[PDB]
Design a binder for these strands. Structure first.
Ligand code: MG
Ligand code: MG
Ligand code: MG
Ligand code: MG
Ligand code: MG
Ligand code: MG
Ligand code: MG
Ligand code: MG
Ligand code: MG
Ligand code: MG
Ligand code: MG
Ligand code: MG
Ligand code: MG
Ligand code: MG
Ligand code: MG
Ligand code: MG
Ligand code: MG
Ligand code: MG
Ligand code: MG
Ligand code: MG
Ligand code: MG
Ligand code: MG
Ligand code: MG
Ligand code: MG
Ligand code: MG
Ligand code: MG
Ligand code: MG
Ligand code: MG
Ligand code: MG
Ligand code: MG
Ligand code: MG
Ligand code: MG
Ligand code: MG
Ligand code: MG
Ligand code: MG
Ligand code: MG
Ligand code: MG
Ligand code: MG
Ligand code: MG
Ligand code: MG
Ligand code: MG
Ligand code: MG
Ligand code: MG
Ligand code: MG
Ligand code: MG
Ligand code: MG
Ligand code: MG
Ligand code: MG
Ligand code: MG
Ligand code: MG
Ligand code: MG
Ligand code: MG
Ligand code: MG
Ligand code: MG
Ligand code: MG
Ligand code: MG
Ligand code: MG
Ligand code: MG
Ligand code: MG
Ligand code: MG
Ligand code: MG
Ligand code: MG
Ligand code: MG
Ligand code: MG
Ligand code: MG
Ligand code: MG
Ligand code: MG
Ligand code: MG
Ligand code: ZN
Lengths: 91, 63, 50, 77, 252, 112
RNA sequence: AUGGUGAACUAUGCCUGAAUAGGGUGAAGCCAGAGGAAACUCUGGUGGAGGCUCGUAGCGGUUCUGACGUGCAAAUCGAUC
RNA sequence: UUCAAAUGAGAACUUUGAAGACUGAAGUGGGGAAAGGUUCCACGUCAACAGCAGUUGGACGUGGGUUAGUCGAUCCUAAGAGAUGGGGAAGCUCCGUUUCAAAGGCCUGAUUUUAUGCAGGCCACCAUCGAAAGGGAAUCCGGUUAAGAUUCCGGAACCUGGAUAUGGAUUCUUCACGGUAACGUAACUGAAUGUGGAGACGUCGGCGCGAGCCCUGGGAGGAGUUAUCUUUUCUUCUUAACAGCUUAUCACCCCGGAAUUGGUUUAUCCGGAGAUGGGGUCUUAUGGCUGGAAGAGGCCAGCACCUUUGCUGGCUCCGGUGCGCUUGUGACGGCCCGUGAAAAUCCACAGGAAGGAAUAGUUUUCAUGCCAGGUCGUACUGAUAACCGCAGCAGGUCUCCAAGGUGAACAGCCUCUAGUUGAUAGAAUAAUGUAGAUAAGGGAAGUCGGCAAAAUAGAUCCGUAACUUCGGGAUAAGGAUUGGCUCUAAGGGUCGGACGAUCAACUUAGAACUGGUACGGACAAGGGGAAUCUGACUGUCUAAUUAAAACAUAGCAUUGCGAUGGUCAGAAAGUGAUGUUGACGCAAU
């Protein structure tokens, strides 16, 4: 009852395309089907639909963000870069 | 007359089947049959206190 | 053609009425050359093209 | 088109105005117990609605036929 | 020979953009008194997905300064901005992610999106899923600000050019393999008739300068003068060099 | 074992060509075309199904009484109870804090 | 050479619509059980993924180098596919 | 295909009767879209035409026939097409469609010389054409013809526009009450302006439910069969649009405050942001009852009698079943670098300009009543003869409805309803053929080459190699089994408190008995295995000699370009594609 060993969600692709493409797909396929925490809302209820739009089933809140994840590591660090500059323009 | 003999269980040996077992009766159908019977029995036994709500749960996950 | 335009049905009517044998008494007129309707039509031989 | 049940209103209908016609039907129905009774249906052609009234009791029925304005052309059976 | 395929694009026709399912065009608000001087607040009424454009869109609706009504503008959602977020726009609008500020009102190091090239042209640079431009410095000598554009080149533009704080949403789309022709098909099914692509070397001569066949080979250099005439411009155009490099970075 | 036919020249199974099978006083099978279903009107600012409001195709709302197109409360049609409860409270608390916004900023005015 | 006419066939994009028996496989997600000092690991279910598979209609046209080859047919017919 | 009769100068071929058969609901059945255009229907009729024939016809002659407020067109907008102020062009005209433009028309007061000039005033980057499959106001049943019918007849309705009067509701607290609330209602003023909603939307999957169909029990009829058996076989037993009450998964409200966490779907989601529980509110999709409506329709019976026609009576009832079939639909779920039209049109809310009563007025979103609803199409075929292929051509051309058995099954084979039995015919059975079969022994020795043929084949159980991108390879290979009959055991629903009552299914495993050892008995239905070259894969193309190893593809790399731009279009332009674009981009290899 373990089912697979490596492939997982990507048993779907069977044998085609070859390991690495299938491999890298798997990683992001898993990101985009994940259920994420809600900022405003607390609940683990943010599901994806269409690249970048991320909306909370429970409280109907929608966030812009990553194509395959809620929040870019690049967006994240820029978040901080911005606040950092902001706190300076009011100190 | 034949349909009669069929439910006397008569014309369905191993050489009277052309469909896979799954094809003639689907497994998922069986399960849903089997499952809802258990769900319903566990329900009745709760609205009757033959078993407590706590045991129920356990048996509900167990079914 | 089932649901048709007036204009065509219009032409269809004229096309039906042209379609008959030459009036026999015309063959009795004086100095008459005509013998038959040499412009007769029939839906299974020569089409109308609308 | 409409069923009527008030015995007061039905009479208010039999005159009305637009009412110039009505009809009287007799159904040989059966009751739940299974005894041959005589249901009689009273129908009045409105102007855009057929008000019909159902009376199971033959009594208040064969009374009511003689309760209509006699200036009303009534079809019988 | 015959008019080659790349010339045949210019007459539009078969090759126009498939735009039925698009929202509207994405633009910034028209630069008016409010945004010229102070700021103006709006609510993002929904964030939505434009067809043929990874990167979602923000329908954020402002009131009308000059009349009783609501005016919906179509913004490109800048990642993290959400429904119900308030969107303040103008010279005096504070440094939060989503607002749209002139390029003079932002400190060096600020990163922004959907920036105008001339003030009031309502958006121009950094608009593709995940992109952004970075202010590097300022200059009162004409209201100008120097930025870093996603391509890497630096451009000096008016400080009255607006941008919207932050990075375009739509994340790292290209990080995921298309896997199969089908997926690419649908991709361009919503953009434009450019797929698949027939290699010219598989053409006959009459369709392409490469199409000269009998062994599939380009025959002469594949690197064409900038001054060559349409009909000859196929391949590596005014290429100032060719081949593999590992170039790491760009123009700093 | 009886078969049937459209009653309109349109021969293609589209949406406007939906068909019902009906047995009739004739005791014969007959088709009837049914106008496509309606959808419940939706909350202005939360898109929920408006409760108490009847569900007809658009022009059929012109044939109908007005208790059919509302409920008795502010935003009868339009928005959905909690959507106006939230609406009211938000207004209050803000207008309240407006006062406070001002008396308080008036206060540190005299501080200077 | 000049001036005209064709996308009713066909190639491609767009718009709006319509269509495709029955089976084999059993991917994510979820439930329970067993072994174990632990970490974990095993078993049994459930679920129903795929430019997945056997195979009609559909679309196609591999082979017989079959039939026909003054034809049913200026491209068809049969089997096979 | 056959027999006979009828009609006729004349009969293999026409009609009626009988037999024998086919199509087998994926139809040789019933309708339509394109297209045709009278081919439809009746009568007369056979020179030509139907590659034999003809008394027959889609032929020839003569006539008849297509009835609408509700079915379409018509209105709307789609890709697009295209007038206008303009800008190019010697010009035929090219470009542009809100475009560098003085681009309008709505309300209503003033005036009671008048239905009218005007005095208020908001609102308007704005031709039009473009769907008989998209959007869309409203009709159903029965009956009727030689041929028309959602069009005529009869009955029952609905919509739209215009009129309006009576009733009812509302008010001295003027513009309604009730319910804690979700909200209820026969109503219950609402200009400008703003806003919200419907119109209005992908695909797949399992699950719930309706409709029709399928199967079936009792009975009330008719029919068949009856040497003998069968309380038997076949069949009839129906209920429209619309109206009233009633009816729902979802959802929402009130009470209440949860770890021993509970609730809970086939599918594991939900709950202090208020679960479970108790009690309500909604949507009316859909079902039930009644009206419509038995007077209709269906099935029988007894009389009547040249015809037309009847006439009089009965009966038309009460259940059951489900992984059933088709379809409709609900709440979920999977999928995307795809997230799956528009506009006309209808409604609502916010707003409160205004107009309104007490001896009286307000309101026609409540019931009732009056009037009108044009124009064009409407026949029929829709294909092995009504279209396109010179034709009555074995080709081609969009779509809907879909019964029984076997069986996994819309397969194959057999049948019912309906429809055909039409493809010149007679006599013989040489060669050689085209299509279908079979061969002793050998088993590819044939041949360029196993070409052609043969062999395998369902299902249950067992079993299963190298290699591998760990997914596969794999139905690998290799085996046993399979009929009939009689039994055994296991697997469910409902009603009464570990039993008990009642109902209703087939399916699964096992055992005995049996036969010329047969049994996926027809039908249906993979041959396998070891390698080399080669393209990764699914996909594509030389319509009519090449389907491949060629083209494509994902993947990889390179080039150009920051809009005063790159690539491309144009004779020219205030011209155009990419562009509803902006480097996670477009363009070029
Ligand atoms: Mg299955
Ligand atoms: Mg299963
Ligand atoms: Mg038509
Ligand atoms: Mg040329
Ligand atoms: Mg294109
Ligand atoms: Mg365009
Ligand atoms: Mg749109
Ligand atoms: Mg293409
Ligand atoms: Mg290529
Ligand atoms: Mg070539
Ligand atoms: Mg060259
Ligand atoms: Mg050349
Ligand atoms: Mg090469
Ligand atoms: Mg019709
Ligand atoms: Mg339509
Ligand atoms: Mg209501
Ligand atoms: Mg209501
Ligand atoms: Mg599957
Ligand atoms: Mg496979
Ligand atoms: Mg296959
Ligand atoms: Mg099969
Ligand atoms: Mg194909
Ligand atoms: Mg075929
Ligand atoms: Mg070939
Ligand atoms: Mg040949
Ligand atoms: Mg010959
Ligand atoms: Mg053969
Ligand atoms: Mg014959
Ligand atoms: Mg047969
Ligand atoms: Mg069949
Ligand atoms: Mg005749
Ligand atoms: Mg002849
Ligand atoms: Mg003859
Ligand atoms: Mg006539
Ligand atoms: Mg209509
Ligand atoms: Mg023009
Ligand atoms: Mg139009
Ligand atoms: Mg009729
Ligand atoms: Mg809308
Ligand atoms: Mg649509
Ligand atoms: Mg029986
Ligand atoms: Mg109706
Ligand atoms: Mg209560
Ligand atoms: Mg209803
Ligand atoms: Mg069921
Ligand atoms: Mg509404
Ligand atoms: Mg007709
Ligand atoms: Mg017809
Ligand atoms: Mg025919
Ligand atoms: Mg023809
Ligand atoms: Mg011709
Ligand atoms: Mg033909
Ligand atoms: Mg079917
Ligand atoms: Mg056959
Ligand atoms: Mg026929
Ligand atoms: Mg012949
Ligand atoms: Mg031999
Ligand atoms: Mg041998
Ligand atoms: Mg030899
Ligand atoms: Mg040889
Ligand atoms: Mg040899
Ligand atoms: Mg062979
Ligand atoms: Mg043999
Ligand atoms: Mg046996
Ligand atoms: Mg290949
Ligand atoms: Mg496939
Ligand atoms: Mg060829
Ligand atoms: Mg091939
Ligand atoms: Zn949330």
């Amino acid at each position: 009852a373990k089912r697979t060993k490596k492939v997982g969600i990507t048993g779907k692709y069977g044998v085609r395309y070859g390991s690495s493409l299938r491999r890298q797909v798997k990683k992001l396929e898993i990101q985009q089907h994940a259920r994420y925490d809600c900022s405003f809302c607390g609940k683990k209820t943010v599901k994806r639909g269409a690249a970048g739009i991320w909306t909370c089933s429970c409280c109907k809140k929608t966030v812009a963000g990553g194509a395959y994840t809620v929040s870019t590591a690049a967006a994240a660090t820029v978040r901080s870069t911005i606040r950092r500059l902001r706190e300076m323009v009011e100190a | 007359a034949h349909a009669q003999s069929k439910r006397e269980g008569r014309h369905s040996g191993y050489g009277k089947r052309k469909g896979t077992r799954e094809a003639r009766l689907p497994s998922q159908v069986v399960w849903i049959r089997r499952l809802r019977v258990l769900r319903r029995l566990l329900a009745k036994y709760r609205d009757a206190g033959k078993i407590d709500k706590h045991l129920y749960h356990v048996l509900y996950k167990e079914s | 053609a089932a649901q048709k335009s007036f204009r065509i049905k219009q032409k269809m009517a004229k096309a039906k009425k042209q379609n008959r044998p030459l009036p026999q008494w015309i063959r009795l007129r004086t100095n008459n050359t005509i013998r038959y309707n040499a412009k007769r039509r029939n839906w299974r031989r020569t089409k109308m093209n609308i | 088109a409409r069923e009527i049940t008030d015995i007061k209103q039905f009479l208010e209908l039999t005159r009305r105005a637009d009412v110039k016609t009505a009809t009287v039907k007799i159904n040989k129905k059966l009751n739940k117990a299974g005894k041959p009774f005589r249901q009689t249906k009273f129908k009045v052609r409105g102007s855009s609605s057929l008000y019909t009234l159902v009376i199971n009791d033959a009594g208040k029925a064969k009374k009511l036929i003689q309760s209509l304005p006699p200036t009303l052309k009534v079809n019988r059976l | 020979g015959r008019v080659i395929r790349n010339q045949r694009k210019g007459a539009g026709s078969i090759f126009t953009s498939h735009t039925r399912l698009r929202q509207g065009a994405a633009k910034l608000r028209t630069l008016d008194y409010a945004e010229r001087h102070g700021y103006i607040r709006g609510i993002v009424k929904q964030i939505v997905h434009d067809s043929g454009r990874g990167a979602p869109l923000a329908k954020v609706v402002f009131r009308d300064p000059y009349k009783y009504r609501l005016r919906e503008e179509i913004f490109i959602a800048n990642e993290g901005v959400h429904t119900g977020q308030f969107i303040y726009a103008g010279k005096k609008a504070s440094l939060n992610v989503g607002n749209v500020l002139p390029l003079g009102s932002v400190p060096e190091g600020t990163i922004v999106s959907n920036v105008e090239e001339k003030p009031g042209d309502r958006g121009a640079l950094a608009r593709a899923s995940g992109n952004y431009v970075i202010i590097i410095g300022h200059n009162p000598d004409e209201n100008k600000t120097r930025v870093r554009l996603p391509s890497g080149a630096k451009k000096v533009i008016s400080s009255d050019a607006r941008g919207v704080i932050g990075v375009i949403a739509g994340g790292g789309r290209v990080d995921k393999p298309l896997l199969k022709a089908g997926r690419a098909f649908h991709k361009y099914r919503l953009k434009r008739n450019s797929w698949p692509k027939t290699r010219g070397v598989a053409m006959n001569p009459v369709d392409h300068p490469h199409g000269g066949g009998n062994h599939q080979h380009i025959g002469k250099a594949s690197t064409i003068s900038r001054g060559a005439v349409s009909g000859q411009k196929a391949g590596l155009i005014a290429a100032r060099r060719t081949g593999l490099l590992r170039g790491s970075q760009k123009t700093q | 074992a009886q078969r049937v036919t459209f009653r309109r020249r349109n021969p293609y199974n589209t949406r406007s060509n939906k068909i019902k099978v009906v047995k009739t006083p004739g005791g014969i099978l007959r088709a009837q075309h049914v106008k496509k279903l309606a959808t419940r009107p939706k909350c202005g600012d939360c898109g929920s199904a408006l409760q108490g409001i009847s569900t007809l195709r658009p022009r059929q709302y012109a044939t109908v009484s007005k208790t059919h197109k509302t409920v008795s409360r502010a935003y009868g049609g339009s928005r959905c109870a909690n959507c106006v409860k939230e609406r009211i409270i938000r207004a209050f608390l803000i207008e309240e804090q407006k006062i406070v916004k001002k008396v308080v900023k008036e206060q540190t005015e005299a501080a200077k």
